[PDB]
Amino acid sequence: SKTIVLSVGEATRTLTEIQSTADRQIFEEKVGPLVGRLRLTASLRQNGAKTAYRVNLKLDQADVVDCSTSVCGELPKVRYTQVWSHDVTIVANSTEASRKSLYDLTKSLVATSQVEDLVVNLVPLGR
Amino acid sequence: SKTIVLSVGEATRTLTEIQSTADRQIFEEKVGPLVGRLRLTASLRQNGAKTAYRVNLKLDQADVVDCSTSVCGELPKVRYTQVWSHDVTIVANSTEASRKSLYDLTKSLVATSQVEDLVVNLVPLGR
Amino acid sequence: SKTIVLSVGEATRTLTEIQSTADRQIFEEKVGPLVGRLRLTASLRQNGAKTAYRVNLKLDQADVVDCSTSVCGELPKVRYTQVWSHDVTIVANSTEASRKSLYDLTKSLVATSQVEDLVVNLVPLGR
Amino acid sequence: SKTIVLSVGEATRTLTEIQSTADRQIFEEKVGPLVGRLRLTASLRQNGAKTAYRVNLKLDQADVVDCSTSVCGELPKVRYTQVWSHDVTIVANSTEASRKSLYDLTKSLVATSQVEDLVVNLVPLGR
Amino acid sequence: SKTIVLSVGEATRTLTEIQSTADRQIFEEKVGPLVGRLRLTASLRQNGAKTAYRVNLKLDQADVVDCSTSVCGELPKVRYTQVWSHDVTIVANSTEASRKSLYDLTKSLVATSQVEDLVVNLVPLGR
Amino acid sequence: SKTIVLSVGEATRTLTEIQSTADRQIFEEKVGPLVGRLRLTASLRQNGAKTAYRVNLKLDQADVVDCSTSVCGELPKVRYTQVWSHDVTIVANSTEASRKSLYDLTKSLVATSQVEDLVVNLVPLGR
């Protein structure tokens, strides 16, 4: 039905709206078993009255492992869970541009080798 | 000294390391007014017994305007400030793999037309 | 009468004496508007039992604006003022060289890329 | 770690970081006796409604003596200490150039034959 | 960037300043995974007022083991942790020599077959 | 009886077992004044259920001076005392390997120019 798609260069992972309030929606990758299935959480509220709007975004990548193959009966389980949440705060009367700027930056900001190098190998930022 | 560049298509805004504490570390595009400058606050800790590592990124885009052209005898002032923070959480023993993919995902995730739309116009996800 | 001159690279600005109390002198740059002109307040006192002498220097750079052109009925006024004061403390029986070295230090100290950056762009003294 | 260097004509003395509070840093010249070594106290605060920022610099030149040679049982001690502090006050919305000029002034200001004479020989600023 | 190197006769292990207050610095060997990575902690305070200076030095050698090779999924983990801390206490007005002596002794002291024999095989000191 | 020798290049100071309790054990260079003598306090315990073994080493260098040459009619007196303690912690089941390396490390670690510098002049580590 209602979905979202991402490309890992060549690969392609697809998310499906599983539950949904207009308030906060939730997506999952219905593929692997039931557990671990990669999840993403959306959100949205209004701080004070009309002051501003706050958007929240969680992302839960659980690392799963099946071994009923090598260990008698033991089932698939969750080793750990990694996350990446975003808390964006936007002003009510912003400039259509003022907002884009923000996006565009964060957009390229992330793509930065520096960033990933940080995240994956814990390499302090700046060069 | 230590810097970070950013691409907005052709435009390229550059950030400079101004401070470096223990857990903290701050960058900024010095140029322009004093108060009107882009802040990038980056942290890094490890709760529990080195059990996990938490990262944090704060981006501050203050929209500033100088009416020194319209009202002779005036200087720049700050309308409002919009932000974008990230709370990434990483497991101490995670696989270089897990850590990788996670980035790659968020990476493409953001570059999504859907996201952009959401942020700029407030368009709930899913299509 | 009693004056002081400074080289701003190529240009040279001149300060003239405006008053001479027993302890404190005062200088102003005779030029431009007679409202906000540069100021210097050099005071010299003695401590308790003639133990030491406490010098003091105040610098007053006012930022002035003339709207006589744009607004009909407007005069020169001062937006703001920025200072720089020094409080040197010297022991009576100091070594001749003892004193000098001090000066020399502060001298090259100020001419520091770091200091400059700190004062103008507000950059802490790392490196 | 975080250091500062100064040229005393030919020689060059180096200052190292000794502490880093949220507001104030502190440096000492790592050398000679560990009693009286040069000191620098760089503090930075903000005024009221973020109107302006108040920087402060303290310089501590202690005059030390080692009588281990002449007197049997004598150690290094400090005869006296001479300081030099700066209290710069800067307005938030200052003009980029507005600020600089200030620095530049104080710079060449200090390098003045007159200043030097005043500090060392105690000569008021006539001429 | 800022580092420290040690030789185990033929081998060579390198430490990198990861975090840093002028107060207490911290080094790690960014090589093996994230966990176990050999660590070293520095320190420094001032007992009472100017009384003396205390230096602290921890060293955490964790014994790590990977077996995702032989045990289904199980990850690398810490078996145990061994340490070696130092608490050196130095007097404010010490003799440049008085201090060295100390070092030099501890230096050779350690290299003593007696010492290692103690540490590794718990062989009471003295022969 | 039972002794421990030390090399300061050519110089060799020798320590003698004077006492031997249960957990304790003390050495000293008897020679010289009475109070002015080098102490080496070595201990050894095992907290918990033989879970771990803790070692402790205390080195006491008292700086002593006799002005019997300058002031006829006087005897030696102790200025101050500087120390160097070690708290090594060893796991009951650790590998002869682990235990080894650990020593070897500390061993070279100390012989480091960087350390020396640190101790004698207070030079924060890292280069």
UniProtKB/Swiss-Prot annotation, chains A, B, C, D, E, F:
InterPro entries: Phage_PP7_CP, Phage_RNA-type_capsid. Changing residue 58 to I/N: Loss of translational repressor activity. Homodimer. The dimers in the capsid are covalently linked with disulfide bridges. The homodimers binds to the viral RNA via an operator hairpin, but also to many other RNA sequences in the viral genome; this interaction probably shifts the virus from the replicative to the assembly phase and ensures specific encapsidation of the viral genome. GO terms for molecular function: identical protein binding; RNA binding. Pfam families: Phage_coat (PF09063). This is Capsid protein. Keywords: Capsid protein, Disulfide bond, RNA-binding, T=3 icosahedral capsid protein, Translation regulation, Virion. Belongs to the Leviviricetes capsid protein family. Changing residue 60 to Y: Loss of translational repressor activity. Coiled coil: none annotated. It comes from Pseudomonas phage PP7. Transmembrane segments: none annotated. It is found in: Virion. GO terms for biological process: regulation of translation. GO terms for cellular component: T=3 icosahedral viral capsid. The lineage of its organism: Viruses, Riboviria, Orthornavirae, Lenarviricota, Leviviricetes. RNA binds at residues 39, 45, 52, 54, 58, 60, 83, 85, 89. It comes from the Viruses. Capsid protein self-assembles to form an icosahedral capsid with a T=3 symmetry, about 26 nm in diameter, and consisting of 89 capsid proteins dimers (178 capsid proteins). Involved in viral genome encapsidation through the interaction between a capsid protein dimer and the multiple packaging signals present in the RNA genome. Changing residue 39 to L: Loss of translational repressor activity.
